[PDB]
A paper describes a structure:
By administering enzyme drugs called L-asparaginases, which act to quickly deplete Asn in the blood, this drug specifically impacts ALL cells, starving them to death while leaving normal cells largely intact. In our structures we observe that the overall fold of each protomer follows the general two-domain fold of bacterial type II L-asparaginases. We sought to clarify this question and to further explain the substrate discrimination, if there is any, between the two forms, by solving the crystal structures of both variants in complex with either the product Asp or L-glutamic acid (Glu).
Each of the four analysed complexes, WoA-P121 + Asp, WoA-P121 + Glu, WoA-[name] + Asp and WoA-[name] + Glu, has in the crystallographic asymmetric unit essentially four (or 8 in the case of WoA-[name] + Glu) identical protomers that build up the corresponding tetramer(s), as shown by very small root mean square deviations of ~0.07 Å; 0.06 Å; 0.07 Å and 0.05 Å, respectively (over 300–330 atoms). Surprisingly, we observed unambiguous electron density for an open conformation of the flexible loop in the other three structures, WoA-P121 + Glu, WoA-[name] + Asp and WoA-[name] + Glu. Moreover, in the WoS121-Glu structure, we observed slight variations in the open loop conformation among the eight protomers of the asymmetric unit. Inspection of the WoA-[name] + Glu and WoA-P121 + Glu structures revealed essentially identical Glu conformations. Pro121 brings a ring stacking force along with π-aromatic ring interactions to stabilize Tyr27 in the closed state. In contrast, Ser121 fails to add any additional contribution to assist loop closing on Gln. As a result of the reduced ability of WoA-[name] to achieve the closed/active state with Gln, the L-glutaminase rate (but not Km value) is reduced by ~8-fold related to WoA-P121.
Author numbering:
A (entry chain B): 3 to 18, 27 to 330
B (entry chain A): 3 to 330
C (entry chain C): 3 to 18, 31 to 330
D (entry chain D): 3 to 18, 28 to 330
The structure:
């Protein structure tokens, strides 16, 4: 049997021999068929809802994943996670885990005690994906609702639906249906081993704020973010990354002062492009291209561990 | 043939390199004359008058322009000879304008917003067809009492439901919680559904005597979030805050504490979501009655901001504002 | 509390009339919402459905909703052809009272079975005051879909149901029901169809278009006594030439040929590439082949006139 | 600048010597193309895509193979009607023996229409064809600023300019005013990796498609058998399920040596093995994550090599 570690970041996503953590033992009690597929070890990394996630928990999680996958006996890692910010954690890991071994994030849109709880099947499927030979070198994945999503592309796109996860710019890379795993595509953007980021010696991540653009917008939130020590700002702009004039002036000021301003969009999908209506080279801004504000924040945070140069950060957004 | 006024809020959404000026007819505004020159088939469908209400990209829109636009639409539709109004508009904030109008226009006559995702000078510009289709929708008898609509990419979207969901695509407009209410294909209009949420004549909002709208900020939630943007919004005089929360409208704890403070101080805090679709629900993880918050339900942050702005012209009571979000 | 009848046909629905009693044992919270009566109308997978079962079901629903004590009907049904049954009922049930169809994409004995929640939500929709006069609805995966618009769009997903031309009309989330839109196409009471005295429905075949297509399937359908043919055409309802010739023959012989599309969404339009008036064809517009077949079947109970059938497709 | 051949299968997709009049009209309508590449043109057929036939597919595939064998040819672009572009693309994806780009492109709106999509689609298609990252992606469809893998692409709407989709996987890349970016690629074998070879083939095997529904029939199966069908795609209800009467007739067809492959009418997802239909007992193949029309193409090619159930199942589980 392959050996897999499940890292829990909160409560049980399913249900209502010790693997080595009470949450994971409850999961194995709820979904006993998992034991036929793999030898499961368990650890409790944090005990929070995903809306309480912090960079400190991310760094801890990434370092631990790296240390687990460096072990000869460990075939893969599964992380149970709240759905609200699973995309951010998955993306962070996708650029910080230095292995080709599978890393799978999984959660549940419905409570484990609910009628028609999604967790049991999601978890079962996640274990099957983790142990599948074809999952090697796919990068970090999210497995939800019979679907396998690349971490670069995945987002929570609905407040409540069991099918809330989507990859709006590319679609799912594969399927998993009652444990049967099939890949149809893979990301051609560099991840994991190919990533230039290394967080092994990092204790705190740089501060990056996100601003929400709208008509009759303001400068006061840019200024508050500067005042609070923001190293970067993601601007979730109107349409193709467009700011209101008053806000643009403030962002220009921010940029001149050494804070990295990266243009994303509030709309939900598509690329926030270079050489559209905003003169990024003149104003000192970066275009985040085909990401979303929350995932752009993650990438900018990592970029800021290496550099605050406009051109080098643009190149990072145009690569990853 | 019916008489329709096209209100332009910026440049031409169709054509390039046109003249306004032709011997047979003008409409009363250069932008609109250029539209007619670019799409001459429009003149067979309706008698077109034109006005220039503003001259901006939609990313520069302001409450002042919205008030001006709404009052003018109300005037135009009060005229016996005016069958409908079409507003040409930038795509970036067309959804906010449409939604504002949907709650402030006191008529059953059609109001149609239309734009173009591609420049009129571009290869394969979408504006000419979008505009032609918009005119056909504006004059169609079935468009009466549908509320304010957006017409883009052969589709008719209810203002309550519409959003720009993509940065660049000609098909960027969607109604993610309900779909389009109708279609328009080479001018052929069909409706399949209609909103059952009150709009236009049935709206309780009235902006005829309003000069400035209340200030409502929007915040973007994320892990390791902060209190400093709530505080800055309070300091700047925010009457309301839309919180674009994680998942089903969930805040980070530090931010929640600041929002609770904001609520206690009389600022209306309304929970929406960053995710893109679905309802930010009551009686989920956030105790809204205890904390003093409103749940915006099936809107999005930007449209929730509009509704809260209008609500704040009448009241800042939590229960009354919740009822407004649960009605409109 | 309101009285509701659940009709089982049934499919694989909740838990590991007896079927309805098992549902109530699996989802006991339903008993707090309504007084549930149960009947077994058929005992089949929905891939075995027939016009005889549809007629029986519709007559029974009409009888039940004519009763003063009956607030609504819920029909448990297999997912494969739920859309066809819902659409049929939408044009044949003569009442404003709610009719809700509900099923499950996963077996009731499966991990994470969808049936229990679907059923619970369906009862809540059936008894909601806003569900009156919405027409027949499908309730699946927290969503309320109008029968006219609904289709099964995926082979296996719990979210397989969609309304690709319009979206869902409402939501139901842990029993909380909200409507955001409603159909403006006539249904139920406003329908001109009446099946109370009908024992067999007219035969309507469906053909699948493709490059290098054939005439032999048109001919076989004619030979087998087809009163209508739905052609699931390429793109905007377009036939291969050999097939078109055969369909023209079929039309001249009195068989109604209606153009739909294989693509999955959008309207198969009039006045596109196919000269329908010349060739003798009807354009089905914004339906799909399977639902167009239902509507043509009903139309054929009243008429086989091209213009009248086009008017029916342009109305319903 | 790179040399690219545009093969036209019908009229102009844009506007109202490269070596073919259609292609010269395209260059007149979209002159910016000439800055990107040296364009040669050929007229392979002169038809709407609803009139496509295997004969035109064979001709097209052989010609593409010839053109890409030429050192001077960087890529091929094929202008095509939208209705059956997905079939032609899928066929070429399994028959073109090269890593050089092959790009299919069309227009949902007529070139003479207001807001015609052809000019931009064509411009974008040339940019994709000449991009270095398009090598070894397989055959692609370029429409509405999107790059779709041939295996996954389908026309999903009757009229919309955004009618093309990849419902099981999404687009593999984007092209926006000529700027090309790939985000994914297919991991299913295509082009050079395909086992199919049509260089000596003159006619493809006959494969019919049947549309399933309640109260279904056996007469269409029988007519297809009578007409010489080597295979039948059954577009089944839900997860590839037949009506009983029809299943009996398909079982008969299978026993008689006709390959029966189960797909679905629904639009997306896999028609799976080991669901409600006992394929091994009845003699059927499950087409998995394709659609009826593309399953037909793959079965047609499979039938040039074998009519064995197990070998055809393996083909559907591979490509
Ligand atoms: N807000 C919770 C919801 C539970 C879930 O859907 O995962 C979380 O993300 O932690
Ligand atoms: N972003 C500008 C450009 C035009 C458009 O995209 O509609 C605007 O919103 O006005
Ligand atoms: N194909 C079966 C699946 C089981 C179910 O849907 O209940 C049916 O349509 O009945
Ligand atoms: N049905 C025609 C029209 C052109 C088009 O839609 O691309 C074809 O496919 O050739």
């Amino acid at each position: 049997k392959p050996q897999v570690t499940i890292l829990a970041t909160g409560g049980t996503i399913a249900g209502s021999y010790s693997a080595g953590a009470v949450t994971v033992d409850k999961l194995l009690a709820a979904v006993p068929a998992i034991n036929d597929l793999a030898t499961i070890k368990g650890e409790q990394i944090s005990s929070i809802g995903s809306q309480e996630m912090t960079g400190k928990v991310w760094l801890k999680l990434a370092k631990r994943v790296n240390e687990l996958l460096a072990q000869k006996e460990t075939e893969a890692v599964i992380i149970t996670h709240g759905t609200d910010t699973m995309e951010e954690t998955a993306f962070f890991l996708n650029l910080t885990v230095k292995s080709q071994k599978p890393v799978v994030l999984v959660g549940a849109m419905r409570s484990g005690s609910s009628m028609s709880a999604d967790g049991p099947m999601n978890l079962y499927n996640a274990v099957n994906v983790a142990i599948n030979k074809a999952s090697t070198n796919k990068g970090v994945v999210i497995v939800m609702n019979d679907e396998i999503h690349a971490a670069r592309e995945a987002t929570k796109l609905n407040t409540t639906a069991v099918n809330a996860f989507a990859s709006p710019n590319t679609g799912k890379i594969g399927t998993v249906y009652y444990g049967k795993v099939e890949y149809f595509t893979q990301s051609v953007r560099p991840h994991t081993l190919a990533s230039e980021f290394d967080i092994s010696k990092i204790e705190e991540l740089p501060r990056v704020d996100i601003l929400y653009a709208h008509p009759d917008d303001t400068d006061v939130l840019v200024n508050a973010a500067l005042q609070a020590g923001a190293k970067g700002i993601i601007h979730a702009g109107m349409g193709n990354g467009n700011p209101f004039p008053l806000t643009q002036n403030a962002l220009e000021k921010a940029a001149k002062s050494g804070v990295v301003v990266a243009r994303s969009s509030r709309v939900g999908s598509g690329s926030t492009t270079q050489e559209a209506e905003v003169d990024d080279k003149k104003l000192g801004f970066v275009a985040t291209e085909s990401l979303n504000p929350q995932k752009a924040r993650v990438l900018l945070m990592l970029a800021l561990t290496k550099t605050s140069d406009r051109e080098a950060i643009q190149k990072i957004f145009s690569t990853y």
